[PDB]
Structures are given as C-alpha cells and as structure tokens.
C-alpha cells in the first residue's frame, strides 16, 4: 500500500470530512492512531489553516498533501510545497477584497487550496483572465495573475496588458501579513 507502515492522526475536521480522510488513508494501508495513545504518529493530517495539535507527532501535514500523494501514487515530500504544511493566515482581515485573481499552471488539490485562500482573503476568483469587464458574460475585469513559471497564454497577456503576474508566494505573504503584499517582490520574471 501507498501509506504502508505509516501511522496517521486526523484532526480539525468535521465528522463527515474525517470519515472521508480516514477511509482514504485505510484504503492505502495507512494506520490510524486513536487518541489518547502512547504511539507517536508519523503524520497528523490537519486543515489547510491548521488546528490545535497537542500530541507530539513526526510531521504536521494538511489534507492537501494527503490528496496530492494519492493523485500521484507517490509519497510526496511535505516540505516541497507551502500548502502541504499549515498555512499561517492573519485572521479577521480580508486584504484582497479589491482583487480579481486568475490562476495558471495550477492543477488539482493545489488549485483548490489556492482558490480557498484567495476567497478566504476576500478576493474574487475567475476561470478567465480578461482584458476589461464584460457584465453581459458575468465576467469582471482581472487584476492579478498567479503563475508558477513564465510563458503561457495568460502570462503573455499579463505582460501585454500591464497586469501583475506573480508567484504563489505573493498570495501566501499576503495571508501572513494581513496586508496586500508588494507585487514587485514576487514577479515571475524575477
């Protein structure tokens, strides 16, 4: 099994989400530690923004890391993506309420967590990266493009329309400070 010889704790989820996460782990040979225990679990699966963890574990990881491992049939390093460990977000603030964000080169559970962060920070997320606003199509004008690497259809339009194309770390730095981070510090060309 994928998670064979691995023990897990599942914390911070509702009753229904916990069962889905529990069954997913067991279907891949994973072991579930029932608290309280003397077993130091290898992993503690927590929500993206984290939760209270009062038991010593090997690594605290998110549901996004878990689902990414299953989609790729590979035990992915939790340290290879900031979304695989709890994301620090300043609560009570919506610093991106003035933004209209479109994503590119983001697929799967990584995209869903990113869309979760953008909406949690007040932003409006659109599948389209448009020039100007078109009310007749339900589309608003775009303000930011979040891409991983240069090149691509949306990226070439961002340089052409003078709209900021930034890394994912701009979204994460915004979430940590509670203020809209400077796009010039997170441009993709640099």
């Amino acid at each position: 099994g994928l998670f064979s010889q691995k023990s897990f704790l599942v914390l911070g989820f509702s009753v229904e989400n916990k069962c889905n996460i529990v069954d997913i782990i067991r279907e891949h040979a994973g072991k579930i530690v029932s608290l309280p225990s003397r077993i130091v679990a290898d992993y503690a699966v927590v929500p993206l923004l984290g939760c209270e963890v009062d038991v010593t574990v090997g690594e605290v990881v998110t549901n996004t890391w878990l689902v990414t491992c299953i989609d790729n049939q590979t035990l992915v390093d939790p340290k290879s993506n900031p979304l695989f460990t709890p994301v620090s977000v300043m609560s009570g603030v919506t610093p991106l309420e003035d933004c209209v964000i479109s994503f590119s080169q983001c697929v799967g559970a990584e995209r869903d967590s990113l869309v979760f962060l953008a909406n949690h920070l007040g932003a409006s997320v659109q599948e389209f990266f448009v020039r100007k606003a078109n009310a007749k199509k339900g589309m608003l004008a775009s303000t930011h493009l979040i891409v991983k690497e240069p090149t691509g259809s949306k990226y070439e339009a961002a340089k052409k329309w003078s709209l900021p194309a930034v890394n994912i770390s701009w979204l994460l730095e915004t979430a940590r400070i509670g203020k809209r981070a400077d796009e010039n510090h997170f441009l993709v060309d640099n």
Binding site: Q105, E127, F128, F129, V130, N134, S153, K154
Partner: peptide, 6 residues
C-alpha cells in the same frame, strides 16, 4: 480575454 487552459 484569455480562455482557461484545458
């Protein structure tokens, strides 16, 4: 307006 990637 750039369409979304497939």
């Amino acid at each position: 307006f750039v369409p979304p990637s497939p």
